[PDB]
């Protein structure tokens, strides 16, 4: 029986590979060679945040591009005012080793997570004024790698246990469990339509997940090492992955295969974060070389280099409205670019 | 400037004062990571230090300085992801079962892996070879010989510069020093000198155990300061 199942799985993998190669009529490069070049993008640091004490490990842009949340290993979440640089709220965390943070779309709640395996959603609109732990839900058997809000009551979170789950804030229990990853989940990004979400794990592969149905629709194995970063294309039809291989790859859900691989010989350090711009042409990816790089989604050429940070840039994100870019590094100094 | 903007700047200055106040407490406390396999007696060591939670923060004070010892024992075996964040810490407390020769090879392999880790290439490792009493009893009984597991032990002579404690049988001393030399060689190979291993022998009833961590952390911080001030 086991041998029959193994042979069936091998035949299915071969058939999937053949079907994927058949549709490989042309690469994105050949079609994007006729378009004008993006040129050099000389970005300058407009704001410098000097509040965080420890290594900045996470950040996210809410519905409003003025407020910015960022997490540090010291157990502090500071809602930074990008415009005026002021500090809106300071949230002393019970778990110092926080590795993720997200700003809810409604702008009322903010989540976090880390080695404690407990996701603490802090309400920023409490009638008492002070920040309070709304729901300290738990249940994961591993460190929380990423968390993102879907609505005012639903939040998806990734854990080191190699499985993702959707949590119900009001009920405080898992709404659905997502399994299939062989390695610890590390990255998670939500689609613009909120229908599907993609997540990466220590395994050299990615999977597309559905929020309404507890099952994965597609699986991408076009990677050489652990995929640490991932981000949904603004249109929700494609996504770029980041791995320690120091090479970014653009995957399209409609094509179901790699379109363009952004790689270079002089880039040997791994990748930790990836983000797309409003137009999608500027593919911003953070590298362990103590600086971020901007790649062209179409031409694949390096658009620019952000050498402002002196330490490993671990997190970065672009504003929703597309007005500025935030980059958080282990140097405890968050520099905004525009 | 508007009144609301001025009050926002005032609250920002208040939050900055709070952060600066917390910064002193943060930098004044020494963070320590406790690693070791399930066989290692790290739990016993933690219990002795009385001077699905993925994190177990243990705080103890010795000589008017606070120590923050973190024990990660409620997570998967894979550690190449979360071990990175534990960088920049004072020292890493690694515990190995020196009595169990079978798991000794796995412990050595884990120690080698942790030592050669990229992001931890600048953090020292405090190596506590626990269960020395069990190792001594075993090597005295003669039922289990290290030669069966390590052939080099047969051709290993006790270090001449060694300082055997009073009442130590030659076999016990030789075995413990062989294990210590194996660990020191594993740490030396590929070691750029940026971080040093602090091997120590710990027992089940030894009360003078936290002093070892105190001395190791003080030496590590002194060396880091010397490197910062360009004195070395």
């Amino acid at each position, epitope marked *: 029986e086991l041998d029959q199942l193994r042979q069936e799985a091998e035949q299915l993998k071969n058939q999937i590979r053949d079907a994927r190669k058949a549709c490989a009529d042309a690469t994105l490069s050949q079609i994007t060679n006729n378009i004008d070049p993006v040129g050099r993008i000389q970005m300058r640091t407009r704001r410098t945040l000097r509040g965080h004490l420890a290594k900045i490990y996470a950040m996210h842009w809410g519905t409003d591009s003025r407020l910015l949340v960022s997490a540090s290993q010291d157990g502090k979440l500071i809602i930074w005012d990008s415009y005026t640089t002021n500090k809106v709220h300071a949230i002393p965390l019970r778990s110092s080793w926080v590795m993720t943070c997200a700003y809810a779309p409604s702008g009322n709640y903010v989540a976090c997570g880390g080695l404690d395996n407990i996701c603490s959603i802090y309400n920023l609109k409490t009638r008492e004024g*002070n920040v309070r732990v709304s729901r300290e839900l738990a249940g994961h058997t591993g460190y929380l790698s990423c968390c993102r809000f879907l609505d005012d009551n639903q939040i998806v979170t990734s854990s080191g246990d190699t499985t993702c789950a959707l949590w119900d804030i009001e009920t405080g229990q898992q709404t659905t469990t997502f399994t299939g990853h062989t390695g610890d989940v590390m990255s998670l990004s939500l689609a613009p339509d909120t229908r599907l979400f993609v997540s990466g794990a220590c395994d050299a592969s990615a999977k597309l997940w559905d929020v309404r149905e507890g099952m994965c629709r597609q699986t991408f194995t076009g990677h050489e090492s652990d995929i640490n970063a991932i981000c949904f294309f603004p249109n929700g039809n494609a996504f770029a992955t980041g791995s320690d291989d120091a090479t970014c790859r653009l995957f399209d859900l409609r094509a179901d295969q790699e379109l363009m691989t952004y790689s270079h010989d002089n880039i040997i350090c791994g990748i930790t974060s990836v983000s797309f711009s409003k137009s999608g042409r500027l593919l911003l990816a953070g590298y362990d070389d103590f600086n971020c790089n901007v790649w062209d989604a179409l031409k694949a050429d390096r658009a620019g280099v952000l050498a402002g940070h002196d330490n490993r840039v671990s997190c970065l994100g672009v504003t929703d409205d597309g007005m500025a870019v935030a980059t958080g590094s282990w140097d405890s100094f968050l520099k905004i670019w525009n | 400037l508007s009144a609301e903007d001025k009050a926002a700047v005032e609250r920002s200055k208040m939050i900055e004062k709070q952060l600066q106040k917390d910064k002193q407490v943060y930098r004044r406390t020494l963070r320590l990571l406790l690693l070791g396999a399930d066989n290692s007696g790290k739990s016993t060591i933690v219990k002795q230090m009385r001077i699905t939670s993925g994190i177990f923060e243990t705080k103890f004070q010795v000589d008017k300085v606070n120590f923050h010892m973190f024990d990660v024992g409620a997570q998967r075996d894979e550690r190449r992801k979360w071990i990175q964040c534990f960088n920049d810490v004072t020292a890493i407390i690694f515990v190995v079962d020196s009595s169990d020769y079978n798991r000794l090879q796995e412990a050595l392999n884990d120690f080698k892996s942790i030592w050669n880790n990229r992001w931890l290439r600048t953090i020292s490792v405090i190596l506590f070879l626990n269960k020395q009493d069990l190792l001594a009893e075993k090597v005295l009984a003669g039922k289990s010989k290290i030669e069966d597991y390590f052939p080099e032990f047969a051709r290993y002579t006790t270090p001449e510069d060694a300082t055997p404690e009073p009442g130590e049988d030659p076999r016990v001393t030789r075995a413990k020093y062989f294990i210590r030399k194996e660990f020191v060689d594993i740490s030396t190979a590929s070691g750029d000198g940026r971080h040093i291993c602090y091997p120590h022998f710990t027992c089940s009833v030894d009360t003078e155990n936290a002093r070892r961590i105190f001395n190791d952390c003080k030496d590590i911080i002194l060396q880091m300061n010397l490197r910062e001030y360009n004195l070395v």
Partner: single-chain antibody
Amino acid sequence: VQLVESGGGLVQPGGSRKLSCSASGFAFSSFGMHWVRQAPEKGLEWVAYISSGSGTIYYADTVKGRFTISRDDPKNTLFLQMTSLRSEDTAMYYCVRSIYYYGSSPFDFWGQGTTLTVSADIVMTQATSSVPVTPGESVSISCRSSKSLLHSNGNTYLYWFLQRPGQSPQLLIYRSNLASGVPDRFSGSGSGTAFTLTISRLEAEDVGVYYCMQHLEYPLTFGAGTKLEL
């Protein structure tokens, strides 16, 4: 959240009295406190202000020097020392909390108030002092300011307050933005100097005195008040 003021009573001219307000149900340390008086059968008027941590303290020209504000965060209490009380100072003082940050709602909670029976600033002028209207009808209130409240940051520092008969003022609009707990029937719009408050469908409990306030400069001036009679 609840603010309870105390210390009111009869005081002769030239005397001294200290009002006290006990804060509870919120982080008093993070909220800046305001003092607003209301003379009998008259509008509102700002008295003094103290910021978080006692860093910034202000007083109105009508009371500067005589009144001194102080707070004790460890006990969550506010104090307003009054000296040389004048016959004109007879009024009911309301303690108000305020927290300043992007998206905040200053002046969101007004205390129960305490009565004291003794013995340039931007001016705000409302369309009318009284407006009789029937229930269910759409009511529109308007006011004008002598200086443009639209600051360079695009924020219109206008506030609207509703003081129902026998109750303390309640915040309705703190900038078009609707305060928490206020029904959607209330809406605010206006230019840099012309402002309008609209009630899409007036309720029986919506009757009362509507007070405006400018916050472009700390010398706060409250409107003359517009009554809505059922």
